[model samples]
Target: SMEQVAMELRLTELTRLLRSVLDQLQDKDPARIFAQPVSLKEVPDYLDHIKHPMDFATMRKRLEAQGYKNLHEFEEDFDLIIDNCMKYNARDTVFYRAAVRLRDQGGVVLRQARREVDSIG
Candidate 1:
């Protein structure tokens, strides 16, 4: 389906951008902490369950229904969110949590979408 394909492509692009931003943050340590942690894991699962007006599934449906002429416009929104996260120095706050949730939610949606894509034999 065109809708699913569009969503998949969009999510793929978002995941790429999310990872790129995270990678850059990691390399530079934007938060700047003198202490070091022994281990760290991906964002918490609860972050996905956070109450957000624009969860991935909901936003995807809205975008699909709107019949966007150029999908990059939708992709650009995610870019802006990532940019804002950086610009505001997102960390240790609700805003940062939302950014983390965005990344994790993208992973969740992309995983399910890939499963569906792969299931089509």
Candidate 2:
């Protein structure tokens, strides 16, 4: 159970960071578009073009699945969702603009987390 304890310790820190990032991101979007999966009907060819789709709910779920290896898995999904948004939306779209804002805000939150969470995960 020692290793399991170690794993939980890391997971707790990651979960904390993930929650902070998602909270701020959802607040930034106000529309909560990134809070859940985009509707299939909303974009007929969504899956076809956007090879990897990521959402806040899915990101939270994955962390609980405990299927992570890296301490920075939080950053991985954080970037994934932001990148997916940028890739899916047009340059001039509102969603695209939010994605850019989220990217900047997330880096601040994520980097701050790293500083608070330094010293071996």
Candidate 3:
């Protein structure tokens, strides 16, 4: 049950962030609720903005990408996007809980990305 609780905790936070993001987009453009067209393209920029998001894929194209390689790294970056998404919409309260989740996961993602990149070397 601990794992279930843990998963629910993460899911709740994730949903909260998603709701907040959707709320803001709703305000920015109500129609976004139906046709939200977000892309992970900004994930790399969010990571460092030094290269294209597909740069992760490029690392794979090289013979050096490792284990989780792109998938794990993308998960981390995507976690940040979720945080930013929540932050974008948070009104009365900052998503402190969500922020912590993103920070922890972001670390995992970054470490994995680094390893993935290094494997290519």
Candidate 4:
């Protein structure tokens, strides 16, 4: 039995959790605002305000590459997705409203995922 291989399999399970959580979050985003990154051609100011861009597509891309080492790492990028939206748009705008909703909904889904992951027996 290989110790390294056992640890590798543990990540496969966490990665599975990340993928499912990612899908749920995107589905809850009915507006599709966070579905893709904002194109600089349309809003250059966004790039200036939001230092780093995060979106569902990029997260999926990173998933395909096995880029995230753990669930916590995946969690940070998801955090950025909502945080950046809130940072750029004013409270009155739908963008900010959606971010708030997504952030709350995000917590439920991610918490559920963590619950499921932690309950492994």
Candidate 5:
């Protein structure tokens, strides 16, 4: 009975803490919404973080699993983010406006990363 009560108390405390955190996060960005929560039930057995640094294998696996085959198509989702940001946070700052547009919509980040990696390669 004591152990069961302790377990229930711990569960209640965790739930309360999670709810408080979720509330604060929701308030910060009311528009931010996840359509569906991903279940982390199937972790791979041979998961070694340090040994396999920059695991392109894992990235490829996840991408293939999720049917994210096209990078160009995937970029459109990010464009919506930039559009929404500018719509919500419009200000006099041209830099902010241009940066957000280029950042979210224009594939500036991936292009820049590619340039750097290409240079190194």
Candidate 6:
């Protein structure tokens, strides 16, 4: 029982933290949106920590749509991309390597965006 409660709290915090990260990133990049092709069924397998039911079908559609409008949306969408890469790493070293490369690139983008925003404020 205590473990369940603790798990719930941790999930809550993760959700909140994710939202906050997206908001901050968006504040820096208004035009940036994180959109990547992600399979619905594959996501649950990767994000096992997410105990609750997620509308992966809906999410998959959204990610496939015109794309994200802001950084916040991108951050949310990126979760699938990240997870998929991780899932692949279990079987393939190439995918894992690519994931690392992409992660570095993403960091650069975020840093540049933040710098641009910082210059203004």
My TM-score estimates for the predictions, one after another, are 0.33, 0.80, 0.27, 0.90, 0.29, 0.39
Full ranking by TM-score: 4, 2, 6, 1, 5, 3
Model 5 agreement with the true structure over 10-112: per-residue lDDT tens digits: 5555444333322332233323321122113542432331122211222333333443323343344434434443543446665246535455433534565
lDDT of 1 at 65: 59
User: Which residue pairs collide in model 1, if any?
Assistant: none
Of candidate 3, the 10-residue stretch with the lowest lDDT total is 54-63
- How would you encode candidate 6's per-residue C-alpha lDDT over 1-121 as one tens digit per residue? 9998976665454444434444453343332222333444766464464332222334445444524344456444554544555554564576555555555655666566546434632
lDDT of 2 at 107: 74
Better of 2 and 5 by lDDT: 2
Q: Please give the CA lDDT of all the candidate structures.
A: 0.44, 0.75, 0.40, 0.86, 0.38, 0.47
| lDDT by residue (tens digit), candidate 4, 35-87 | 88889989977777889999999999998777888778888999999899888
lDDT of 1: 0.44
lDDT of 1 by residue, 22-88 (tens): 3333333234221132112543443343322222333344444553333345445444444445444
Q: Write down the worst ten-residue block by lDDT for model 6.
A: 28-37
Candidate 3 residues 1-121, lDDT tens each?
A: 9998976665444444333332332243222221222345644344443232322223223313222323344354445444554544454444444444445644554465456444633
State model 2's lDDT. Answer: 0.75
Please count the clashing residue pairs in each candidate, in the order shown.
0, 0, 2, 0, 0, 1
Q: Residue 118 in candidate 3 has what lDDT?
A: 47
Give me the candidate number with maximum lDDT. 4
Candidate 4 global lDDT: 0.86
- Ranking by lDDT, best first? 4, 2, 6, 1, 3, 5
